[PDB]
Amino acid sequence: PAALKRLAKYVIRGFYGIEHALALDILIRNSCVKEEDMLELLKFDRKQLRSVLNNLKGDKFIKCRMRYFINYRTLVNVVKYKLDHMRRRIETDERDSTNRASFKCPVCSSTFTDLEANQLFDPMTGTFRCTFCHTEVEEDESAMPKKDARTLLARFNEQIEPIYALLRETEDVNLAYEI
Amino acid sequence: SGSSGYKFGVLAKIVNYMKTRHQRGDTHPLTLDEILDETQHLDIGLKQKQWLMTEALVNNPKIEVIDGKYAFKPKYNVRDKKALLRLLDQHDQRGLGGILLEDIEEALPNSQKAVKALGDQILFVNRPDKKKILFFNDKSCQFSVDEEFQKLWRSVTVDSMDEEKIEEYLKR
Numbered sequence: 001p002a003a004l005k006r007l008a009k010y011v012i013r014g015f016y017g018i019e020h021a022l023a024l025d026i027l028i029r030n031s032c033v034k035e036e037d038m039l040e041l042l043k044f045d046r047k048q049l050r051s052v053l054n055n056l057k058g059d060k061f062i063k064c065r066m067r068y069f070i071n072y073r074t075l076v077n078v079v080k081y082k083l084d085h086m087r088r089r090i091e092t093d094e095r096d097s098t099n100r101a102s103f104k105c106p107v108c109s110s111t112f113t114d115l116e117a118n119q120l121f122d123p124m125t126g127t128f129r130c131t132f133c134h135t136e137v138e139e140d141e142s143a144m145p146k147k148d149a150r151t152l153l154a155r156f157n158e159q160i161e162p163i164y165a166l167l168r169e170t171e172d173v174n175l176a177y178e179i
Numbered sequence: 180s181g182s183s184g185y186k187f188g189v190l191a192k193i194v195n196y197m198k199t200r201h202q203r204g205d206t207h208p209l210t211l212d213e214i215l216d217e218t219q220h221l222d223i224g225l226k227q228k229q230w231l232m233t234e235a236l237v238n239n240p241k242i243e244v245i246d247g248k249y250a251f252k253p254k255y256n257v258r259d260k261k262a263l264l265r266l267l268d269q270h271d272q273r274g275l276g277g278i279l280l281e282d283i284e285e286a287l288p289n290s291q292k293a294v295k296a297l298g299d300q301i302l303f304v305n306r307p308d309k310k311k312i313l314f315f316n317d318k319s320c321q322f323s324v325d326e327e328f329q330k331l332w333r334s335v336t337v338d339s340m341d342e343e344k345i346e347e348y349l350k351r
Contacts, residue, residue, distance in 0.1 A: 013321035015331075019306050022315060025273050043276055045307055058337050078334065081346045086330045088349070156325060163322040 001030075003174035008074070010167030014160075019044075023052050027061070033072040079171075086157060093145065094153035102141030105130035112137060184227030189220075190235040194242075198251060208248030211236070258285045261292055267300050267316045277314030 005028060012024045026038055039049055053072070056062060060078070065071030103117035104110065110130060112120070117128035117137050128137040161168070193214050200217075211232040215221040223231070236242055236249055243252035258281045266275050283289045289296075289312070293303050302316040324330065336342065 009318070010321065013318055014324055015327060017320075018302075018304050022273065022304075041272070041276060043278060043311055043313060045311070048307075077343055081342050082330060082334050084346045084349045085333055089329075089333055160322055160324050 001174065001178070003170050003177055004074075007167050007171040007174060010164070010170065011076075011079070014164065014167070020052060020055070023049075023056070027056075027072060027074060030073065035070050038072070083157075090153050090156045094150050094156075097144040097146050099144050099146065100140075100142035103128050103130075103137035103139075104141050105133065105135050105137050107135040108133055111141060182230075184230045185223045189223065189227070189231060190239075193231070193235075194239070197249075201251070208245075208250060210248060254281065254285070256281075258282065260285060260287060261295065263301070263314070266314075270317075274313075274315030277312075279312035282312065 008024070008028065012021045016024060023038070023042060023044070026033060026041065035053075039046060042049060044052070053062065056072070060075040061073065062070070063073035063075060065073065101114050103112040103114065103120075105112070108130065112128075112130070117130075120129050120131060120137075121127075122129045122134075129135070130137055157164075196218065197209060197214060211228065212221070215223060215228065221228075241251075241253050241255045243250035243255060266277070269275055279289065289303075293301065295301075296303065296314075300316040301314055302319075304313055304315070305311075306313075
């Protein structure tokens with residue numbers, strides 16, 4: 001797990017804030033980590049340290065090395081899982097959605113279709129007039145993020161891959177060295 | 180329970196009284212016979228008396244001796260102020276627990292040093308704010324991961340199982 005520790009170095013620099021990261025730095029040495037020792041060494045608040053530990057426990061990290069005195073471990077098997085669900089949500093939105101193109105009169109907040117204001121479309125003004133009041137409609141009833149989100153979601157984790165390449169490679173080496 | 184002499188709290192009590200009477204108005208250096216005397220706790224036993232004098236007022240990290248008498252003076256030594264590059268490169272205890280029990284005031288209020296300390300490797304984290312002030316330094320957040328909150332928010336399963344296999348199935 002030498003190349004896994006090297007990955008641990010890259011994830012704690014790409015994901016967590018310092019309060020987590022300082023604690024995670026201690027987790028570096030997987031020889032012996034007591035709750036009393038880690039508390040005294042970090043000088044973090046006991047309630048707060050318990051929160052971070054509970055948070056790390058949620059990540060599956062510690063393997064409760066009970067004596068009671070506890071040694072903390074690391075069990076992040078969801079690393080190759082988070083990516084699958086994150087990439088899913090990225091592609092889901094980037095793809096495409098139906099666009100609700102319709103008119104709406106700002107004065108009476110009445111709702112029209114592109115069809116509704118088409119019969120209304122007033123040829124003397126080259127625009128669309130509401131029904132019972134000649135106040136001009138709204139250009140679009142609703143706008144769906146689609147091609148603008150397309151650009152920034154095609155540059156989402158794909159643009160955070162190059163800075164992730166260091167760890168991508170070193171983990172592939174953990175995943176390969178230890179066979 | 181290690182070594183105990185007479186009644187517990189003689190130290191955490193002698194120092195406190197000495198502090199108290201000095202604040203109250205009695206402002207002059209004292210002796211171990213003298214606190215005992217003035218509280219007539221003189222009969223604490225020579226052994227305890229001695230152990231208090233030689234050790235209790237030796238293990239105190241901030242007690243001040245010119246010579247015979249013992250004073251307050253929280254600043255007991257010259258703080259190294261800046262150039263703590265030795266403690267920054269001491270990569271054997273993750274920064275050695277930087278604390279404000281001697282930082283601030285000295286010849287400088289931490290902030291001025293910190294800004295240069297901010298300019299330099301030195302890193303400051305007031306997560307507990309006034310209660311705990313600490314310094315540890317190196318490898319600042321390499322990447323931010325746009326929408327890291329969202330990726331963490333999306334995965335909030337915790338205990339639920341049967342997810343690792345769904346990973347490979349989506350990559351197949």
